[PDB]
Design a protein around this ligand. Structure first.
Ligand code: K34
Lengths: 179, 245
């Protein structure tokens, strides 16, 4: 079991903390949803290979440009998150996060992840966004952004229902194992 | 951590830690406030435990078993005793507030109504100056500590055996040397998230809402000061590289 390091980046409202919690517990919390995530080492077997994947969150570091890069040393795979209920979080992907992650993590694979995919067909979400002349991010808009930033791949998930969550972390492990 | 505190913070939430007959006596908004205060204290207990692994397991084990060159153990674990002193004091104050709030005849049923004042005290005056000085120093030495660790693990046989030996137990899975250093660096940026969510459920008493609003502002001032005082030290970097930054 080789050790690999994963870091999740993205805006404060992208759902990165929730995603790490749901994966690490293999359950959406039924009693209390934690505010923060410390770290975790997941045992994962992907395509016949056993890996210990250390998980780290960047939540709370978004406003601190000198503290935030301390999370990046020796990272093996980056999960770059945006929320499907927020086209504004997707616009900040090529603007701020991509040049930062390419600077501190050169040649590290980046997986662009569309979170909260359950909200794409949510009526309250569609009504709220229409007031600011917006709509939920379409899957093709996510793919095009991923292609544009040179991401290893594009994936979507919902921490609420767990759909796609296992797949995201298994693919992150595969990317971490590549040359 | 000591068994008494581990057991008091074993449950996933305050609502599962207290007796179900005690939980039924409170309003929904009080349960939400108490679950977030419990997460703050539980994560502080874990953070103090991380600092004890660094001082007692790693640092002390290297001094008593290995023959490292002078200044190597300090370089691997910068400011660990000052950090341990800051957070053990803060944890003691948090656990004393919980202890005083316990119902007579119970070691688990409590409600903390006055957290704001404790947070204002921790994040102002001499203790905020010490946190700012200690984290500005620690975070500026983060890169140097990681590089020093990597060199020793790859070139010193006895150091590699030591690390593999003390990190072998399952309870150390998340707590290798580099993992402890990043857990500590990330701790300070967790405080605003926890405080803001406690504030969200503390509108019932206006003085408490005001105190948590002041505490949140003080924590953000501390973080801004620490962030502005960081510059990664690099062993071997020449003066020309520094004054041309
Ligand atoms: C080059 N691209 N992004 C950067 C950053 N420096 C500090 C925080 S982000 N450098």
């Amino acid at each position: 079991a080789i050790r690999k390091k994963l870091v999740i980046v993205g805006d404060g409202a992208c759902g990165k903390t929730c995603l790490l919690i749901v994966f690490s517990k293999d359950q959406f919390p039924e009693v209390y949803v934690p505010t923060v995530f410390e770290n975790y080492v997941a045992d994962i077997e992907v395509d016949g290979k056993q890996v210990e994947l250390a998980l780290w969150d960047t939540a709370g570091q978004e406003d601190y440009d000198r503290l935030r890069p301390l999370s990046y040393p020796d990272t093996d795979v980056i999960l770059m998150c945006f929320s499907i209920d927020s086209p504004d979080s997707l616009e900040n992907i090529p603007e701020k996060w991509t040049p930062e992650v390419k600077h501190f993590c050169p040649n590290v694979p980046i997986i662009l992840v569309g979170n909260k995919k359950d909200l794409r067909n949510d009526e309250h979400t569609r009504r709220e966004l229409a007031k600011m002349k917006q709509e939920p991010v379409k899957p093709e808009e996510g793919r095009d952004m991923a292609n544009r930033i040179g991401a290893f791949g594009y994936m979507e998930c919902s921490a609420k229902t767990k759909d796609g969550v296992r797949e995201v972390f298994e693919m992150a492990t595969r990317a971490a194992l590549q040359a | 951590s000591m068994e008494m505190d581990e057991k008091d913070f074993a449950a996933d939430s305050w609502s599962l830690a207290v007796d179900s007959s005690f939980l039924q006596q409170h309003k929904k908004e009080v349960m939400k406030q108490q679950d977030v205060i419990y997460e703050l204290i539980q994560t502080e207990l874990h953070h103090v435990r991380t600092l004890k692994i660094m001082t007692r397991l790693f640092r002390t084990g290297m001094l008593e078993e290995l023959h490292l060159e002078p200044g190597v153990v300090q370089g691997l674990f910068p400011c660990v005793d000052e950090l341990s002193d800051i957070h053990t004091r803060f944890l003691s104050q948090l656990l004393e507030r919980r202890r005083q709030a316990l119902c007579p005849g119970s070691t688990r049923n409590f409600v903390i109504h006055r957290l704001g004042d404790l947070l204002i005290s921790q994040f102002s005056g001499p203790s905020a100056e010490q946190m700012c000085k200690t984290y500005s120093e620690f975070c500026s030495r983060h890169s140097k500590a990681l590089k020093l660790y990597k060199e020793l693990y790859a070139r010193d046989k006895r150091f590699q055996q030591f690390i593999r030996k003390v990190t072998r137990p399952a309870v150390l899975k998340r707590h290798g040397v580099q993992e402890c250093i990043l857990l500590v660096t990330q701790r300070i940026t967790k405080y605003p998230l926890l405080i803001s969510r406690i504030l969200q459920h503390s509108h019932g008493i206006e003085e408490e809402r005001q105190d948590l609003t002041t505490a949140l502002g003080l924590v953000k001032e501390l973080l801004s000061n620490v962030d502005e005082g960081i510059y990664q030290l690099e062993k071997g970097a020449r003066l020309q590289e520094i004054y041309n930054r």
